[PDB]
Amino acid sequence: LSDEDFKAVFGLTRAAFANLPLWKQQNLKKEKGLF
C-alpha cells in the first residue's frame, strides 16, 4: 500500500499506524479485510 492509499484505508499514514500500539495495529489490520 502506498502511504497515502494506506491513509485512505486506515485513516492515518503508515508512520501514524506504526505509532499505534501493536494491538491497535492488529485491530486495524483485522478491520481492513481479515475479519
Side-chain angles (χ1 to χ4, degrees), residues 1-11 13-35:
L1 294 174
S2 310
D3 177 65
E4 298 175 285
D5 183 80
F6 184 102
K7 185 192 63 173
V9 181
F10 294 94
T13 48
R14 301 184 72 194
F17 187 87
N19 183 268
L20 297 168
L22 180 65
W23 60 269
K24 185 64 177 297
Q25 295 183 29
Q26 298 175 150
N27 278 23
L28 284 169
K29 289 299 193 64
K30 288 193 291 291
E31 292 185 67
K32 174 183 178 296
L34 183 57
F35 293 111

